[PDB]
Design a protein around this nucleic acid. Sequence first.
RNA 1: AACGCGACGAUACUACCCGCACGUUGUAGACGUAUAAGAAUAGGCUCCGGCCUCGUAUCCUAGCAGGCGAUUCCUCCGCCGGCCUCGAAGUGGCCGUCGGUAAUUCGCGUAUUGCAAUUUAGACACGCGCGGGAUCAAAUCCUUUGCAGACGACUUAGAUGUG
Lengths: 204, 87, 62, 108, 190, 137, 79, 174
Amino acid sequence: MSSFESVVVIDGKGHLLGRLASIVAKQLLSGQKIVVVRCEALNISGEFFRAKLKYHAYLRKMTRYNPTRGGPFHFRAPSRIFYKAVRGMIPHKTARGAAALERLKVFEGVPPPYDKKKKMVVPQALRVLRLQPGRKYCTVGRLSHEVGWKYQDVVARLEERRKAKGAAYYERKKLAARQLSEAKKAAAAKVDPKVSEALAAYGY
Amino acid sequence: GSLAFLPRKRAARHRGRVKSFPKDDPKKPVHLTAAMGYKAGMTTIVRDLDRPGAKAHKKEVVEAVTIIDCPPMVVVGLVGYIETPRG
Amino acid sequence: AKSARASRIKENHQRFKKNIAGPVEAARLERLSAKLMAIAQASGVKSGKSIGRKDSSIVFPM
Amino acid sequence: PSEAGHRLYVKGRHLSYQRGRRNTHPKTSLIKIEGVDDTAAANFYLGKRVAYVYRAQKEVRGTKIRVIWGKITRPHGNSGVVRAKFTHPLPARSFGASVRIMLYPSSI
Amino acid sequence: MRYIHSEETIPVPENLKVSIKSRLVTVEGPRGKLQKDLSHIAVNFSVVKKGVIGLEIHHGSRKDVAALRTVRTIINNMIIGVTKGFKYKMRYVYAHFPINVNVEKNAETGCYEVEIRNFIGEKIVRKVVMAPGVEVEISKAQKDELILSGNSLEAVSQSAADIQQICKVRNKDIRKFLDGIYVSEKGNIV
Amino acid sequence: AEINVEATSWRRVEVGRVLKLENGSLAAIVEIIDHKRVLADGPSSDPKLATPRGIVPLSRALLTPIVIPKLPRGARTGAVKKAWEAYGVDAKWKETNWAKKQLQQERRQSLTDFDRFKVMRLKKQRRFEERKALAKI
Amino acid sequence: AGTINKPKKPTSKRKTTRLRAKISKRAAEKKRKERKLARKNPEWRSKLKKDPGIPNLFPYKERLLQQREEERIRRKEEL
Amino acid sequence: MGRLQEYQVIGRHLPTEANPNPALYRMRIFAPNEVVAKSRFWYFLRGLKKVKKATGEIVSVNVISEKHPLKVKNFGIWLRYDSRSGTHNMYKEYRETSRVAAVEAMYADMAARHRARFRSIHILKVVELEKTEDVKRPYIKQLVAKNLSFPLPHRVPKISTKKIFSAKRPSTFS
RNA sequence: AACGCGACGAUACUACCCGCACGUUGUAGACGUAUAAGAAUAGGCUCCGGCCUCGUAUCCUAGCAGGCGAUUCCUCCGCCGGCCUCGAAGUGGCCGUCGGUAAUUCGCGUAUUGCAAUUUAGACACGCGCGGGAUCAAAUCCUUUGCAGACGACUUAGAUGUG
């Protein structure tokens, strides 16, 4: 509904890379602060050897005299691949583009500051909503691991720990919801019939 | 030369760092990996060689050996590291 | 000549590692760790049992 | 303890000037109003007043907060973005900043 | 051409339990249990009769209904493996150098190991590790033959292929050097 | 031979299935044109649920859990009408959960400013009672 | 081939303007030569062409042929 | 293509002293408007007989529509289309509620499957199949299969395109 | 990475921490900047009754920019402590004191900013002050060394000593 927030956190799982990058870039240039998690869980349409071939051509592309300066720095992390897409989609060689890049943050996995915050999702880039069911797709985590990313296992272990903590949190949440439903029934008896009928007519 | 020892620069530190310890598993006994010493020189020796298959097998060979003064080291601390997505 | 990174050479090295050097280095490490052990053995909040807090950023300031 | 808000305006974001592929026209600005998504929702806000409230270093007559005033003129596109005309074109560094849309003059 | 409907049926014997989750299929029977995910194929599972499982597809293409055929055959293969088992009978032959085959089972990982020695007089020991759940024996019914049985047809056949591929000649004459381990018979345990 | 199967339970497009249109209306399928368009008719006496006979896309449609049992394929407006009041489609639509959600949305949208203030006050009273109940347990 | 592991130099799809023009002038020249050879045309051209006929999958082919026949006889007798 | 309705166009050669009361030809065509109707009428008569727009007049143009456009029909279309190799006959079928809708579908299908254009397609004869037995194509025939009912798997929900961010992951079941 | 990051040591002035007075001090841009399951999408959730197009949902939302007093309420906040918890770039729970508090009703005050004029009000940062606690350091030059060296640079030594 075109809502403005302090910062929107996007769970990158199940998202198509280019479409999520487009939406994120437009939001950054409009003035929204964004934080993207699970870039390793991001998806790319097509087949894995197509993505790997594209990345290997990218690796071919290299400066001749001195790779240390000026050369195309090939980043092997999924967060940095997503950042490369967003940077290519915004004018990074201007102060406004630099400002948008400073409103953008990206991570692998879900850091502990963001594990307790609400993770949003963009329908316009969801794989299950965009891709035809029979088509093939690949994951940026697999691509990064096969092109030289060194921290796939550590991220997997941290995600497993986070999900165990989330399971405990969800047990507590279920207990709280049961208590809330019970109290609402008990209290209903001890509420004025007029308040209830009035609220029902008003739609609450 | 080899393009594997480039950017042919002076060592940033005089001590020299390990840069890689052998990988660790809990099944082995507790032990230390590295140690320190000071190069004193080198000298000549004769070893009765037992290299089955060599022409110097069961023969005396003259070899050059380097000698390292190694006074006992003192433990003064303990550091603990954690694994992160950045290393 | 087989390269040093040949698969068959790697498999032969793996077998040699697993069937000779394994036991030899295991015995060596047992003795060395024995010597190391010889030299070595030669309220929660107010006690330290509960690990509490000692003394750029990842989040955007609000 | 009122513990409530005091907002009488709709939030908005100054996006850019009226522009083509190359040329830009600082006379008219583009405003994305919070919550509006189509031309009818924009038609509700045509004629409403809009203020750009920023801060400077020197206090002139009791404050450091300056304001640039203008009004919504006509809808832009089909996504609810509107055109706004101010007494002075907005500073350009403000591309991504907040604008307050006040409901006066009101016709309801 | 976007056929509206296509349906196929697997009959389940009276003595099996076929528990299918979203697209996970688990079959229990007297021989044991086998589990397989077919989440890569778009298919709707249902029950059409008392002992018949129907797999169905809607608004699909010819490739899709071909995938329906493949799924039916795979599930039937699982059912018949859990009922009657699966058995590959292999033979090792030689001209001058007897081939020595040793079968062992270790407690760790619960797998079988086949050690092959003196193939064409070679000094190398060839180790082949069977997949979990496949049992290999030197059976005393015929000479120079090896029985490789189990519940998963894929595992049984792949183990047989692994042995046959590990014992293959190099830089010799195919028409003159005729020794190796070959799959002689294929069928069911029961 | 026991088979435990739980894959899906869809609602089928079929002659007699009544479907909801974004105007909030209802229409029964009388003929299937293709896998994307059907011929439908809403003869409901309620002006809010009435739909003129015509072609409707299944993308614009949503399948409600109501099916008229045995109305013939290609039945004209009179037959669909008689089937509608014979089966009592309007009462079942009202009892469905979707209609309750739509009614709640309509009430909340038609609710005014003084009504909003009274809603807040009444919710605060009901919430005082709810918090008393929840504190005990 | 090992294209995935080691791709080669890409085949640029960025059209140059020197070639984008050569192809236009060559297309124009080919059209002119086609028209000139069609003018030359040392080969007979007839008036009536081979009508492929009515498809047999048309379910009313019999009725259309019957209408054609009856129209033929009617025209013949009237004229 | 576009919005079409049926047009009958009757036209004749201008009366002369030698040939008064001329032949008064007629045919039915599909056009967005009467202007295109008249233009293609004169085109087809120029192609067939020796009647031109200069020496001819449009006696009548009449909009004919569908008798029963609230009932579902099967239509057989016999047409000619010319590609780089030549002119080809095709018979296809369309399950629609009007002849204009059937011709809409025919032009769309020609464009999609054979890259044919409006001036490359000749519509020879469009018929309403009387009996179901007359359907020759398996797609419409499976649509006319008895007791037809099918589900709608994987329906992506229609989310407003300005709703950039959502809190719940959407479902594709209803 | 000389404009990537971490741990630890010692830090004289300065200001090193705290309380609170603010700043005619900065900000690519507060104004309720409120909202954590995981996982599938040819399935899922549950209180096991049932529910799932739909976040046009939930919480919160009233009072001189939010006064004073009373009837009535044990509800929601907050600060300190205690026990514990959170290490991926480190926080939250329970209990305890103390502080504020329309869930109902009422009285006394709002005026004059004159018919609109950002409703100067948030956060982080930095500075200048007060009164409380704490501490009394290093590097460079210089001489020297040759494990170094075009020159810088580097390895050393120089306070009482195994100099």
